[PDB]
Design a protein around this ligand. Structure first.
Ligand SMILES: Nc1ncnc2c1ncn2[C@@H]1O[C@H](COP(=O)(O)OP(=O)(O)OP(O)(O)=S)[C@@H](O)[C@H]1O
Ligand SMILES: Nc1ncnc2c1ncn2[C@@H]1O[C@H](COP(=O)(O)OP(=O)(O)OP(O)(O)=S)[C@@H](O)[C@H]1O
Ligand SMILES: [Mg+2]
Ligand SMILES: [Mg+2]
Ligand SMILES: [Mn+2]
Ligand SMILES: [Mn+2]
Ligand SMILES: [Mn+2]
Ligand SMILES: [Mn+2]
Lengths: 364, 385, 363, 386
């Protein structure tokens, strides 16, 4: 699961039709890039295009139906988002368009049309919102809930994976590593016991659960090790630690006190942003057989950090520039525009109300 | 001619919510009077002047007051840019400092310039090399960037050698990078974290002096006496004693290097690190039981043993009530936290038996139980494989 | 409903006997103050002390009980929060506590031992969590769900009043103006009609329709006040009541030929500005029933860039000539010089604890 | 001696996502060569140098480049702080600007100093008064309070300047940055003192030889007295400010008294227009630029007084403005419309239930029978329940 390109048209204050491509020359080299602009320029629109083209939804507007399309640009006839994404060497593309009636800037909102092609053999795979949604959920493995948990941390909700409930975290770790055989092995021991006395008690093997919980705990321990490797540069005070409970759950260790452990819902706003950024960057660097999270986009949390903490965290952000992953950060802060070389700049056009990107990304 | 060489001031640094303003003010006063006394002709700061990219108000107050009090001497300040210093802030005030016998360089690509001595005679030339960004110089990867820095240095030494003509003018070079065999500390952030690990000393061009600084402890690279670090003039991260803080008064002779006097910087605020168990902590606290020192020395208690679980900070504060010391930290030690890795690649290629092996390792297995339970597992995989 | 003082003890990372009083010298003069400190210093702790002492809760921590007292400071045996608040001319003093087992830094948590009294009498109004909760819900008028959208906007949730569902907004407008007699009138017309001209115009079933009209009028006054505030902060948007039976506001975009769109399509910084304008208008509202005097913001100023933050901060100086005790919280370095009266929070040497001032310790 | 007087530069201002760097660069070049030609000895910028408190990089580049090019003329720049300028940013660089014949006064309470003339002679004495905050002049503490505070501050500083003048007749030039009673106010002017003292009477000013003021972006004389004078911005900082009345004031003094106040105008480099009325009036005014070759396009805005806004108006205005060298900035509706939209406090705690009933009848189009039959049916039934 990686993002190759992104094509949108009249999605928000971005009028016209634009296309960015992460396999072109500015993005393939560095990997880490930024999206920089003033307040209200159109920065979150380029992530809502991804969420719209994949899951028919954006984190602000919960539906874009026949009724209530609050997305499309004022006095325009139509909109379309279209993403290209690669999973396991297969380069699919998704599509989402909607027209008003008779090309009028005010009319009846018609029915959206969707594609979800394969684009290698050029075949189509869906034509309805149900078929497209279940095919992408079984194709990438990421539902919309898990997408906002892992691959896209939206604005104001960076703590979706750190402060999750245990069942959502369990579903995400179950999707990263396919652990059906760990339940399958721990299914037959319920009958091979019915020595198998001590083994079926140690390896809890009733319906294929406790062994699978052990596999999830091991994946979480590897993830927490990677997270502390990332976190020792960003904020050196805390450390993640998979706590001892029957439900898999992490908590933070405050090294500045004795070693006193406490849960993640007691951190600050800026500290919680740093811990959640560390956890997301660990989840990017983790490798597995089932699904892989290569692309990663995150909205602004950097305003919550003050000056020196922002300097430390942004100096520690350059370690990914020597990688092949496409981490795409988004903020407006004046420190970020010089610390990061490869940028997407969003400019408002003269206070008319619309906006535009840099001139390469125009579809012409 | 005489230069003073110092580096790595880290002005406006935040040191566990303590400001280092008094120590920098004492050091800058001392540097002014020393530059007056020892008849120096230039001062060179090789990078890391400011700690952050948006330094506080009193840091810029300190730096502006130092530059404006330098004007009553006839000296000449040269300021480089480290890995901490913001480029555009130094480039905004580039030419307004040139009206104060002060030159700053932050970007890469300045032509090497001559220096005057205190009577206007051209004394030496220098090729100013700041911290080169990995996006600035280039267009496997490690030898690519290494060769890039190498030919950059060769190019600027070539231009400085061409600028010197056939005149008694020594070449001074600058730098802010890490090299092979470097006493690295914790104040030192890591540069080129994906590409390089160090820089070979033989890649430097030959010159009359090569003033570097990134590492905050004074040392010599290899055996080349003309290539020296200076390090910070104050302690920065508790790993540095209050004796190895030197400013190098360098004097030249007729186009070649003559002497590098290591005059030391006096301490205003001392530090102290305390390791071991709690009784050895008390025994190390014994050496302040009577002495009256008016700036309280900042402690860093580090516990090594398993006394971490007890109410440490109350006990340590109850100890340190009477003696005039001041505590900054209580921690389990780094040497403890060095070996807490004890590991781990992934579970992707990792077999279910190795998952089962890690299951058994938490148990109390015997050679029966590592062969009765293990044989039951290894069969029941291949009853289903 | 006005916060007079606030006294806390060992709450999150403060570890002391701190007490601030908004009727002392530096607060009664200006009114608008700020709480300034570095990252992780303890700024939101003073802000959730009041919601702990009033509603036994916190925007982060949902339950604070004998099970899982997650806030109380490490290596500390007790914690207490206590707020003084006045309403309709008279004062009250809510109180909350906790102890460990045997005054020891580890042990079993106990019963929180909560109380609520009235000042100038010493009369203990309640002693259990249920009775105190219903007593403050009928005393101040607003419970926790309205407190975290009218009087205190927590960190990251500044849009709790702008982006609310219509029933919560309807409950808050029902609490600001008592529309009980507005229901009695058009309940009578449901029976006095046997004429239907009145029972078509203000024609209700159980008095609800006339109450809907009174709510629409109160909201239209509130939206007028909000546009008066909003014309300085961000001049692009305006608020207006929707043409719908449910009380919903939405934004007129003055730049794009006054095109009208809803509030859930604004930006992050723009949504902060509109929600700040709306919350400031809610303080300047006046009624005979539970007016909102104090106001506490938490964050949002990081979402504004520099050339918007300066305009918003210059528009914030308009309340130094007021009697409202609006207090703001941020860490942004542009704010420490704009606002003269400040509460500074310091970290003590990186031990992990913190302290704020010398004039605020009780001892 | 001949000084120059200007104010309200607003460097680094954001004007509807357009940078004014070209106009400020041309004006600073023009001011350099003009102050060189007319043999000026001191330029006085009386406030609002930078627009924000954290200005961009190119604004600081402009201001530093201007100060460093000033050194070839031998002048002596004086810079004050308006109501936009951050205090600490100027207070950091005060001591390092003092080594460049440049005095920067931002805080309140500087001693009045003595200007040199261009040959080192002690020419004039000035009272540097920046925009006074309401906290550094007032005690712990309404309108008369702040008015008397500013008044006695001005009287105190003028007294100290009169004392420092001594036997030799030298002009004392008071400075300032505030609004007065005869003020042609505008839109770029952020309103200072919004809680108290919305104006300042001109007769409270002490009798100095010249009083150089700021904060009003149009050239104006306050209360008839010539020696008190705004100078206004050197470029249009809004749309209501006309592009011709953009003056710098060359002030020539003589023998201790004021002699000449010459208003020399700044040449335009970026014209801007305002277009009001109906749509056909917009077309008629757009017919002006129908043929002229104009290389920097004229940034005009559209105000539409009628109700033609609700259609696809930006389509129409854009399709009109294809062929012209224009580059329209914005298409807003009307200010004068939004002046009249405030025909509506009057909260419902004051408003009686019959008044809420009256607001209900007003939404209907009921007649005098229904305004008396339904009203009398209502107005008796209040007491029959309550
Ligand atoms: N249908 C629409 N047509 C045109 N513009 C719209 C429409 N809906 C919303 N907008 C505006 O589009 C702008 C872009 O908002 P965003 O892209 O979310 O802001 P942003 O780029 O995230 O900047 P931040 O997050 O505040 S720093 C907002 O100011 C909206 O008011
Ligand atoms: N029971 C506790 N024991 C020790 N430390 C705690 C406890 N509860 C909270 N803290 C710490 O107290 C610190 C202060 O947290 P907050 O006050 O919520 O953050 P903050 O002041 O809002 O910082 P901001 O919002 O980023 S400016 C955090 O770093 C917490 O880890
Ligand atoms: Mg956004
Ligand atoms: Mg907070
Ligand atoms: Mn350094
Ligand atoms: Mn360095
Ligand atoms: Mn002005
Ligand atoms: Mn002004």
């Amino acid at each position: 699961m990686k993002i190759l390109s992104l094509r949108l048209k009249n999605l928000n204050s971005l009028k016209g039709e634009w296309k960015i491509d992460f396999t072109r020359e500015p993005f393939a080299s560095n990997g880490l890039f930024a999206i920089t602009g003033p307040t209200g320029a159109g920065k979150t629109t380029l992530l809502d295009a991804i969420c719209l083209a994949l899951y028919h939804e954006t984190p602000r507007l919960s539906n874009v139906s026949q009724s209530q399309n609050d997305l499309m640009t004022r006095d325009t006839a139509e909109c379309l988002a279209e993403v290209e994404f690669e999973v396991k060497g297969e380069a699919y593309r998704a599509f989402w368009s909607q027209n008003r009636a008779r090309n009028q800037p005010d009319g009846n909102l018609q029915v959206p049309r969707v594609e979800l092609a394969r684009c290698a053999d050029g075949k189509i795979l869906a034509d309805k919102v149900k078929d497209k949604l279940e095919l992408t959920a079984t194709l990438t493995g990421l539902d919309y809930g898990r997408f906002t948990r892992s691959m896209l941390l939206s604005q104001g909700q960076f703590a979706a994976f750190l402060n999750a409930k245990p069942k959502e975290r369990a579903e995400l770790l179950e999707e990263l590593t396919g652990t059906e055989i760990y339940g399958q092995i721990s299914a037959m021991v319920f009958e091979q016991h019915k020595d198998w006395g001590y083994l079926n008690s140690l390896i809890g093997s009733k319906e294929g659960d406790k062994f699978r919980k052990f596999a999830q705990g091991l994946t979480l321990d590897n993830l927490v090790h990677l997270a502390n490797q990332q976190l020792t540069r960003l904020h050196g005070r805390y450390l993640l630690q998979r706590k001892a409970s029957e439900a898999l759950e992490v908590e933070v260790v405050d090294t500045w006190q004795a070693d006193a452990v406490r849960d993640t819902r007691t951190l600050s706003g800026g500290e919680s942003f740093l811990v959640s950024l560390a956890l997301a960057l660990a989840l990017s660097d983790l490798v597995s057989h089932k699904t892989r999270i290569d692309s990663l986009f995150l909205d602004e949390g950097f305003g919550t950090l003050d000056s020196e903490t922002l300097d430390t965290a942004l100096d520690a952000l350059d370690a990914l520039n020597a990688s092949g992953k496409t981490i795409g950060v988004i903020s407006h802060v004046e420190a970020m525009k010089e610390r990061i070389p490869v940028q997407i700049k969003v400019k408002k056009i003269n206070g008319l109300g619309y906006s535009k990107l840099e001139s390469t990304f125009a579809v012409k | 001619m005489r230069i003073l060489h110092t580096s790595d001031w880290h002005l406006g640094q935040n040191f566990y919510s303590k400001s280092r303003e008094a120590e920098h003010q004492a050091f800058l006063d001392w540097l002014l009077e020393t530059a007056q006394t020892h008849q120096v002709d230039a001062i060179i700061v090789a990078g890391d002047v400011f700690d952050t990219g948006s330094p506080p108000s009193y840091a810029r107050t300190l730096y502006n007051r130092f530059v404006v009090n330098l004007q009553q001497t006839g000296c000449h300040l040269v300021v480089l840019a480290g890995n901490h210093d913001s480029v555009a802030t130094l480039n905004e005030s580039r030419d307004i400092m040139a009206f104060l016998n002060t030159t700053v360089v932050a970007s890469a690509g300045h032509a090497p310039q001559i220096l005057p001595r205190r009577d206007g005679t051209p004394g030496a030339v220098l090729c100013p090399i700041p911290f080169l960004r990995p996006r600035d110089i280039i267009t496997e990867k490690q030898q690519h960037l290494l060769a890039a820095i190498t030919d950059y240095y060769q190019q600027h030494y070539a231009d400085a050698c061409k600028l010197r003509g056939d005149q008694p003018l020594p070449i001074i070079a600058t730098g802010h990078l890490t090299t092979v065999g470097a006493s690295k500390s914790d104040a030192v952030r890591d540069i080129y974290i994906g590409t390089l690990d160090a820089f070979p000393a033989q890649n430097f061009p030959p010159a009359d002096y090569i003033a570097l600084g990134h590492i905050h402890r004074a040392q010599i690279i290899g055996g080349m006496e003309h290539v020296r670090y200076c390090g910070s003039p104050i302690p920065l991260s508790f790993d540095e004693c209050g004796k190895s803080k030197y400013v190098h008064l360098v004097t030249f002779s007729n186009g070649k290097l003559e002497s590098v006097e290591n005059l030391n910087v006096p301490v205003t605020q001392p530090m102290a690190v305390l390791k071991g168990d709690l009784a050895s902590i008390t025994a190390q606290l014994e050496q302040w039981r009577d002495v009256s020192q008016e700036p309280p020395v900042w402690l860093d208690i580090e516990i090594t043993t398993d006394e971490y679980l007890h109410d440490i900070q109350r006990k340590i504060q109850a100890l340190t009530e009477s003696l005039p010391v001041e505590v900054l930290l209580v921690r389990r030690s780094r040497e403890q936290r060095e070996r807490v890795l004890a590991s781990r690649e992934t579970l992707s290629e990792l077999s279910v038996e190795e998952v089962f092996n890690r299951r058994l390792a938490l148990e109390e297995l015997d050679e029966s139980q590592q062969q009765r339970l293990q044989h039951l597992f290894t069969t029941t995989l291949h009853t289903l494989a």
